[PDB]
Design a protein around this nucleic acid. Structure first.
Ligand code: ZN
Length: 223
RNA sequence: AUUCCGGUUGAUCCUGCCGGAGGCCACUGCUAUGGGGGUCCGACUAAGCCAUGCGAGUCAUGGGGCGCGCGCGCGCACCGG
């Protein structure tokens, strides 16, 4: 139904859009680990239809910024938004706007275009299951003054982290994690970007064939 | 729950302190139906001050006396352990 509904009224402008409209590329994993540029949010609307439901579109922050022209001062809105399916795909965006609606829509489109793919597993000394309910190993991210360290935890231990990270990890599909932070967490933008980069850096650790079985590692969607 | 939230600017990122939010102990305001268990109740200030009465005795299988009874027993103080 809605698949073709959206596909019909979309006229592509890029080669990736054209391939996704035709049907050469059918799965979401086919666009990622090649140096493709992603300039249309319709690609992601079509391949990941879960990122249009309101349940998957957290608005994280609204800020009121000021510019001086006295002259009189001019008021603007900055919006920070996250989107994602709860099975391995999350993105984050910022939007300028003169009105909050404009800001929000721009932020969500930039979030769709800034989409990544993560890994999941179990690497805690206290569960040793082989199911993907957490992260498989410990990772570190940074932005500005904020430093985030994410550690694997056991089942039933729900997201021991600040709220911004709670939302981002929920959307990425993580259920259990321990955290250490350093710096100024009250800058929501930088706290969020640090968590996002920590999740991205799950793909920069080198592993071996046995680690996959040992930790139940999963790249993207499960099952 | 190996956690963060507010505050310095016309707006921003930092440093850095104040404050919030949890637990235990003591005093206190308002209010209060019941049963059970426990190693709780002048320690912090005065190891400051007092009245009344109690908190350490026992032995007739160590000895003499006296009394109350019926050579047998019951009691009183005393010597002695
Ligand atoms: Zn586990």
């Amino acid at each position: 139904e809605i698949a073709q509904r959206v596909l019909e009224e979309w006229e592509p402008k890029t080669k990736l859009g054209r391939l996704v409209k035709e049907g050469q590329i059918t799965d979401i994993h086919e666009i990622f680990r090649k140096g493709y540029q992603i300039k249309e949010p319709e690609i992601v609307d079509v391949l990941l239809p879960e990122v249009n439901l309101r349940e998957n579109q957290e608005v994280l922050d609204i800020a009121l910024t000021v510019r001086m022209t006295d002259s009189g001062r001019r008021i603007r809105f900055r919006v920070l938004a996250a989107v994602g399916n709860r099975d391995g795909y999350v993105g984050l965006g910022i939007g300028h706007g003169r009105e909050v609606g404009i800001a929000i829509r721009k932020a969500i489109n930039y979030a769709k275009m800034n989409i990544i793919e993560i890994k999941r597993g179990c690497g805690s000394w206290e569960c040793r299951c082989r199911r993907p309910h957490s992260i498989p190993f410990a990772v570190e991210g940074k932005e500005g003054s904020v430093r985030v360290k994410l550690m694997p935890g056991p089942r039933g231990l729900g997201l021991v982290i600040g709220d911004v990270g709670k939302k981002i990890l929920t959307l990425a599909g993580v259920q259990d994690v321990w955290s250490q932070t350093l710096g100024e967490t009250r800058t929501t933008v930088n706290f969020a970007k640090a968590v996002f980069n920590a999740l991205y850096n799950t793909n920069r650790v080198a592993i071996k064939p046995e680690d996959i079985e040992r930790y139940g590692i999963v790249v993207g969607r499960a099952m």
